[PDB]
Amino acid sequence: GSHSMRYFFTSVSRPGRGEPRFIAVGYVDDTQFVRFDSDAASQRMEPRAPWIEQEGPEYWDGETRKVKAHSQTHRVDLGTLRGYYNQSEAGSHTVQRMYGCDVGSDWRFLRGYHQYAYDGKDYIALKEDLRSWTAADMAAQTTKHKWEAAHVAEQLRAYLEGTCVEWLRRYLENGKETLQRTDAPKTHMTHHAVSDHEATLRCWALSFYPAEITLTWQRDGEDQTQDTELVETRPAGDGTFQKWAAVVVPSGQEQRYTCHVQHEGLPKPLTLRW
Amino acid sequence: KLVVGAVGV
Amino acid sequence: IQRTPKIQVYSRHPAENGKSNFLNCYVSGFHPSDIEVDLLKNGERIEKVEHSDLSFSKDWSFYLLYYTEFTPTEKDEYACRVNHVTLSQPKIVKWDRDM
Ligand code: NA
Ligand code: NA
Ligand code: NA
Ligand code: NA
């Protein structure tokens, strides 16, 4: 299957006193491996997976230096963006940045990305060609001109096709016991009767990794979306994920309905029946 | 590993 | 922009009375990031609740997991209480045991 390395940065201005909140998180696939929090005691990039603790002091010094550089750019950006949008010093505003690379099953480069948002809206994004920019509005267009003049796309393309995929491959190897392991969903059905004429069947998928999963209902072997509820996939808190899908059925007709579970960890999809 | 630099908007 | 949090309250493992477990409150789809999340035992705020590092989805909306160790019983009621700029009143979601 495909793999990804992604970094997520959140920047929140705190008008009244002092510096903005800065939070950085790094993931391989659906596994957090590093964090930085401006408000934490260490003022260091910190490990959040055992396989990254394999990295020497030089790694933690380098990642701490780079994440502090990211933090200072975001601090300046909050000021720049307040200027571009003619906003007062009084309001809290949010910057978000996400960048990273996807590799296929062969661990070769598939795609790179670098997306930036201001107050929860698209600002500027690197296009799939890693050579050009999507600017949402005229403030972002000013940034696009600046980044074109400074050859930012060329710098990011070199990282995304190079260091990003090289270090993703290193992490996948070092963390192979967990990162290269698929955890198939543990599945069961439950039954809930609201009235004498209506019952709800719930199809559960527990303790799976990675998070990507498809739960579908059929009635007499045909797909049914009517009278179904699918919850957002949610973290168990132990690194695995959970999901359920529910269908409302006439009391006594439970046997017509089947739940279908697709997951990377399953050689063939599972079928459950009440 | 993080990218080395971040150019301001 | 303002987006109101989605809330799921659930246990890590299928619950049995007297068996140590983890109570989760997963808050997602919200903006901006400032949010207040408490886990309640019989309406009283649980101390020393931990939470994940702030991250976000493709649409830029934030998600957090708040969690604590708990031992479920027959009588004890658990819930998640969420305040956010999008809510005129705190939202309380009761733990259902079969989510
Ligand atoms: Na930190
Ligand atoms: Na810190
Ligand atoms: Na934002
Ligand atoms: Na920037």
Author numbering:
A (entry chain A): 1 to 274
B (entry chain C): 1 to 9
C (entry chain B): 1 to 99
How is this structure described in the published paper?
The conformation of the peptide in the HLA-I groove is paramount not only for HLA-I-peptide affinity and stability, but also for the TCR-HLA-I-peptide interaction. To study this aspect, we individually refolded and crystallized HLA-A*02:01 with spliced epitope candidate KRAS5−6/8−14 G12V, non-spliced epitope candidate KRAS5−14 G12V, as well as two control peptides (peptides #1 and #2), in which either the N-terminal residue or one of the central residues was substituted, as compared to the epitope candidates. The global superposition of all these four peptide-HLA-I complexes in the peptide binding groove reveals a similar binding orientation with a root mean square deviation value (rmsd) of 0.124 Å. Throughout these interfaces, extensive hydrophobic and hydrogen bonding networking is seen with the majority of peptide residues participating in the contact with HLA-I residues Y7, F9, M45, E63, K66, V67, H70, T73, T80, L81, Y84, Y99, Y116, T143, K146, W147, V152, Y159, W167, Y171.
The digestions were measured by targeted MS, which used a m/z inclusion list of target spliced epitope candidates identified in the previous pipeline step, and confirmed that one spliced epitope candidate, KRAS5−6/8−14 G12V [KL][VVGAVGV], is generated by proteasomes under these conditions. The KRAS5−6/8−14 G12V epitope candidate was confirmed to efficiently bind the HLA-A*02:01 complex, in contrast to the KRAS5−14 G12V non-spliced epitope candidate, which had a measured IC50 larger than 300 nM (and larger than predicted). Some structural differences in individual peptide binding were observed when comparing the 9 mer peptides (KRAS5−6/8−14 G12V [KL][VVGAVGV] and peptide #2 KLVVVAVGV) with the 10 mer peptides (KRAS5−14 G12V [KLVVVGAVGV] and peptide #1 YLVVVGAVGV). Specifically, while the N-terminal and C-terminal ends of all four peptides match perfectly, structural superposition reveals conformations in the middle portions of peptide KRAS5−6/8−14 G12V and peptide #2 unique from the remaining two peptide ligands (KRAS5−14 G12V and peptide #1). In contrast, although the structural superposition of KRAS5−6/8−14 G12V and KRAS5−14 G12V peptides bound to HLA-A*02:01 molecules reveals a similar type of HLA-I interaction network at their N-terminal and C-terminal regions, their structural arrangements deviate in their middle portions. Due to this, the spliced peptide KRAS5−6/8−14 G12V makes several unique interactions with HLA-A*02:01. Firstly, in the structure of HLA-A*02:01 complexed with spliced peptide KRAS5−6/8−14 G12V, the P6 A residue makes both hydrogen bonding and van der Waals contacts with the side chain of T73 residue of HLA-I, whereas the P6 G residue of KRAS5−14 G12V is not in contact with HLA-A*02:01 and its P7 A residue maintains only hydrophobic interactions with T73. In the HLA-I-KRAS5−6/8−14 G12V complex, the amino group of K146 forms a hydrogen bond with both the carbonyl oxygen of the PΩ-1 residue and the terminal PΩ residue.
